[PDB]
Amino acid sequence: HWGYGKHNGPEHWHKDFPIAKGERQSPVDIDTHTAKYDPSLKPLSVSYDQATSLRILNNGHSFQVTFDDSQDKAVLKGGPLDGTYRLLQFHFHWGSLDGQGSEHTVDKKKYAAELHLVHWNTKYGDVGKAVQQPDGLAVLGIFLKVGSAKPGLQKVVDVLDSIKTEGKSADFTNFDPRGLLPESLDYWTYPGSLTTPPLAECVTWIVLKEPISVSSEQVLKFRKLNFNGEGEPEELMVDNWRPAQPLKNRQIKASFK
Ligand SMILES: [N]S(=O)(=O)[C][C][C][C+2]123B4[B@@]15[B@]16B7[B@]89B1[C+]651B5[B@]8([B@@]512)B7493
Ligand SMILES: [Zn+2]
């Protein structure tokens, strides 16, 4: 089964998922000087006031916080998008040390981690149908740098000891994802893919320019998670990021000058 190690990591994924070598794979390097400002792009609309978090889960590749997506309670609209996208979950990618961990890069710079808020287009009715469509998903990507603590992340950090190993989950109600967002919604956007198997080419990427700051103590708690199940040899959940993929025939657009 796939992972992030030497014998099952990103360089192997194309054998089970041949679209890994496709025309619109993610992540990519964002070359800031080449991205074109597009004055036709709209401000992004993030409407998270009625969000309902359900559970926190260690899936053996990241941890995720899952939301109720049975109604339009936490939705993304506007920006580059047509129609309405429901929040399903958020998760992170991070490194073994602070100089790597992000999936997207900015002028080849790697951040310590990257937050992904995963949304699906309501016009396809469920996420399984949405992944089969070129405009099925919108993923909001936010970079994390290490410095001051992010207060709105601490509730997440404090329960990670209860989901150490693959399989494990816990109740995680009343969590407000607005506390994870930077000041500015200035963004880059391009057509791409899921960054994990099945690597489906179904995502409109929206990558915020402004990182959030988290503390060293917060990120160290991410690095105590395990890729393994309880009882199996202990392998730290670190370096769970796919490297930048070829841009090929795509344009990255900027919402800002
Ligand atoms: N890094 S990423 O591109 O946000 C992929 C996150 C993982 C996903 B599998 B879990 B499963 B498959 B689609 B579906 C859900 B939707 B993403 B969430 B992909
Ligand atoms: Zn992701």
Using DSSP's 3-state secondary structure scheme, residue 100 falls into coil
- DSSP H or E stretch at residue 222: helix 216-222
| Ligand 1 centroid to residue 251 C-alpha, Å | 23
Q: What is the resolution of this structure in A?
A: 1.2
- Per the structure block, which two tokens stand in for 133? 């469509």
Cα distance between residue 150 and residue 148, in whole Å: 7
Distances (CA, A) of 55 to 61, 65, 160: 16, 6, 12
Cα distance between residue 137 and residue 130, in whole Å: 6
| Ligand 2 centroid to residue 123 C-alpha, Å | 22
Distances (CA, A) of 28 to 102, 205, 222, 232: 11, 10, 24, 34
Cα distance between residue 253 and residue 141, in whole Å: 15
Residue ranges with CB less than 5 Å from ion ligand 2: 116
Distances (CA, A) of 150 to 49, 155, 215, 239: 19, 10, 7, 21
The answer to whether residues 65 and 53 touch, using CB atoms and an 8 Å cutoff, is yes
Closest atom, ligand 1, to C-alpha of 131:
13
- Per the structure block, which two tokens stand in for 34? 């080449």
Examine the residue annotation and report whether 61 is marked as an active-site residue of this protein. Answer: yes
For the CA of 245, the nearest ligand: 1
C-alpha 14, offset from chain centre: 21
State the structure-solving technique: X-ray
- Per the structure block, which two tokens stand in for 240? 């769970």
Q: Tell me which DSSP letter residue 178 carries.
A: G
Q: Tell me which DSSP letter residue 133 carries.
A: S
Comparing CA positions, the residue from 27, 61, 99, 36 lying closest to residue 227 is 61
For residue 257, the number of C-alpha atoms closer than 13 Å in the C-beta half-sphere is 2
Comparing CA positions, the residue from 139, 133, 98 lying closest to residue 115 is 139
Cα distance between residue 66 and residue 59, in whole Å: 12
